[model samples]
Target: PLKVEKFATANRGNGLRAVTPLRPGELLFRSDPLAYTVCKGSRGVVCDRCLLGKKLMRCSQCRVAKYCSAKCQKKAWPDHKRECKCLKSCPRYPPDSVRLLGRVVFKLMDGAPSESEKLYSFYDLESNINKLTEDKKEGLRQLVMTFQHFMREEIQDASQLPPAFDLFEAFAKVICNSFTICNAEMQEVGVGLYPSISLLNHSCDPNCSIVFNGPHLLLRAVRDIEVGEELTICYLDMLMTSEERRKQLRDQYCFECDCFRCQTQDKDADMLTGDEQVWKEVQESLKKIEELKAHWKWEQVLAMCQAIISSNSERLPDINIYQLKVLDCAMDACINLGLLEEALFYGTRTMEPYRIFFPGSHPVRGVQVMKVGKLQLHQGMFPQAMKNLRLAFDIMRVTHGREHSLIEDLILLLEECDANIRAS
Candidate 1:
């Protein structure tokens, strides 16, 4: 029997096959927290309060949106004076967005119990949502409907939101395909700001387990997972291909994955089909992909990725690692050719899959982003480099924390990028 710790609760997958036995109320996992931090994006340029990346000496208007220093602020007096009006008029966005987007400063309520307070707890969603009385639940249901209505009516200001139809369709897919993970990143001071609710990591085939601590979410073993059980967690239940999974995770979560389950799933179909000839060809392609990786051959990688796409585009639009690596190669070639913009563009393309491939706190996500940021900096796009670096740093803080070797490296690289930006 696995250790049944606090925050352990039973969860059943709607799409799980009937042949798989599931114990009633058997603990699946507990909620966890998503990491947050001071991204290098908001560094020397941004003021202490605003956290906005600006370059100058100081705030001419005496406003604290962002400042370089007293001299720059004064020198920037005229622009600062005019821009401050827009900053003042722009209303504070809703708290939910602030919390979700992690824009606002996280401050615990005054006099709140420090140790006892739940850091990343999900009290109202999932089981809590199920526990309410029917009448009260009905009211809660109404609240959900109202929220949906609110989202549809007020939130869809077209200019502020995605196209309405796309949002609606995406919402359904999101509800169907959302799960969580408590990755290696959440175990940091001040980083676990949000409640444990956000800590849910994505899993491909989540075994093991998740448990909650006193605001610090924990991941313990739930089953005697055999060697290479693909320690997975369902980020959500989307019938996705491995390639799509990689891309979605990259875009959403920010990481690169090379999991075994990702391997057996074939190019598109989950299971290898009985077609021996097709399987043999796929195996050959896999061999080529391995060779490409070993030699770091861009053409081979590109050919392999294109082959996968040509063979299987219907089941999934996203390309697998071979394709992604090939794209990485193109970027490298562009960099060699001195086409920095194109190189930076492709570099950004290569790192967009952590959201679907790994748990929310996967360290590699930040690592991948940093890789992309480094390329951007090299390409001489200072603003883009700062954006990617700051976001990557925020995620890196979540994964490696402040003290990790990678963190310092990224910070130094960011400093260099900024210095170059100013010099340029």
Candidate 2:
């Protein structure tokens, strides 16, 4: 059975107040899916790929859309045969997204009941977005129309296969565009993994950054976090002002943040001192930071971050939320620069605060230890890599408990490290 455990890690900032000290590389927590179903819900006509309760396999002729199976195909043949050829030839992903708007695409062709309303909310919200946005409406509309044309074309093609390629592309675009700006939580049913980081909510200052290890996401401290600090990650692009964050959150996800950072604006002018000035600097830096992120120019990202570091080193003391992100971005940029030593240096430093924030046994800390080890491995420091990897696993066992994905990742990386050493 998949296990779900609660820890102090999820709290981010204010939640930090309750956390215990975290070791440099402790494993956090893990949540497994309740059921493994390729199909999403308790609906009709599931596909064989996912084997869930609901599905659609397009007819053999038009081949543009989907249906339950060969059985369903034969049953619906009189009406679908002409369109099956073309539908079968159309792209599947985007067209499927269009056809299943506000619906979960399951592989199962038969089921007795239906999925509950709560589980479908994400899909429904997506539909709402399509309804309101003219550009998305047209994008989805035209994209779907292409599938319709492909369905028509499929009837003539000797091959009976549906136009699966077009559908996949359409699906990818729709997904990227939809969740790119849309405030929706995704729970991929039956897939090997899903993201817990996505649920961390939005904050200008986040305590944790997420690492997607195959199908699982592990959240680790980006800084030395205290026992009681609330765990947070920037849900949007980067360092946004309080107002900008509030507007975006409200506009997209329909939630407002009253986190301490957000409420700082309400503080009395006289009461605001020290880091308050730093906040203003952060607001200004956000613009540049965003421009760099948009361009994927990590070098420009590093230069912009250096300014924050120089400004904050003397002004803010050890670390704060904003600096954490700067360091995070800097670490990312370092990877791009191929400065593994620099990446290792900053990667180790990023956790200094996290150790204070969480206990050695904290699962999130375990992920950090894994990261540090990875940096060492990248720098060709095999011995140090092994040391960090082993230490990370020891802490992970307690933080995420036994047999968690975090443990699995450590083992996998350690194996590679061992193989590299053997090869040398």
Candidate 3:
């Protein structure tokens, strides 16, 4: 979907550019992971193979691995066997990042299918080793120590494993560049090393976004791009202010963001204009709502959200970050409690605010529309549900793909809506 080009002054060493004029929501490319592993926190909560959250059976030997079914356990054995043994021997299971790095090292040692060609293009990637400070360098060294025993067992050839200092450099490269693998719901399922995709640079306001369709990541255009336009994605949460974003990018990726959005000093000043009293009230209310949610007090949470919405009426259709957060909580709480009518109301309320805040095919808008459509379906508003779902399907299919779990669910819902219409 793209070809790499070199430019002397390019912020990143090199960047990927569009091969052709890409329309908004165009599928630019799909990158298969070089290496990936379930996050440490998700060990027993999700199936090792399918990554679906389920009650799982533990691997008999290691007691470290878990799978939703015996079939999934059998399927994962070829890759999991060594890793299982490796973990069992360890004092404790390695962190998710180390586990993924281990897989990369393992693949490298196993040799490329074509020995002449490298297993992955790791050489072209940036290590930023010289840029690290004394403190940061010490942290990296400590992290490297945790993996030495694991790598030693995996790499029999002393030639393959780098010297202790060089190993720190390697881990830094992977840590900065690794992609957080998320499900359709945008929950982190794992972490992966995608060599080619990592080459795409960061922009605070990017024209493209990454969507995970199972383990494969689809790079989709969130806005129209002319031929030769650089395809970029935000490495940090776009919701953050310029200063916060700049500090995060510099500390993590070792680059300052000079993107168009970051250059503006008061980009969100107008939207954010409000008395401190209102902000404080909303924050307190948010905490109370969260506490209520912890106790499954959905009705009270909904009532509290309604009170906030009513009190903050002047901020209607505003993208003030606080307002968005409250509306989102209300929308989610209503949905969780099967209060479809309230869910539809709060879901619709978020539409304009989200659209006003986010530019061009942001996933939140697509999800918002899909959810409103779903609520309408449950409320027996089939015609409206069908219309909303069709519109949502168009936007969603571009990023999520037709095969993504959410898109598949939308298709089935649309089909059900059609059947109801035909019967009527």
- Which is the leading candidate under lDDT? 3
Q: Estimate each model's TM-score.
A: 0.33, 0.42, 0.81
Write candidate 2's Cα lDDT for 1-424 as tens digits: 2112223333221121214654332344433221121222211233322222234764444444344566645644543333344334544433334433212222111222232211222222222243234554566567656545544543233243322423333333334223221100111222221223223435555555444332233445544556544555556643234676677765544456777767894322322234767856764685677556443467888888777766545454334545555666677677667877777777787776556444335444566677789889877888889888887877665544333455666788899899988888
Task: Tell me how far the alpha carbon of residue 218 in candidate 2 is from the true structure, in angstroms, after superposition.
Answer: 8.6
TM-score (C-alpha) between model 2 and the true structure: 0.42
What does candidate 3 score on TM? 0.81
Candidate 3 per-residue C-alpha lDDT over 278-310 given as tens digits, one digit per residue, 9 for 90 to 100: 765776677787666544466887888888777
**Model 1 worst lDDT window (10 residues):** 101-110
The pairs that clash in candidate 3 are none
- Count of clashes, each model: 39, 97, 0
Candidate 3, residue 255: lDDT? 81
Cα lDDT computed for each candidate against the true fold: 0.43, 0.47, 0.72
Residue 13, candidate 3: Cα error in Å is: 0.9
RMSD to native, candidate 2: 13.0
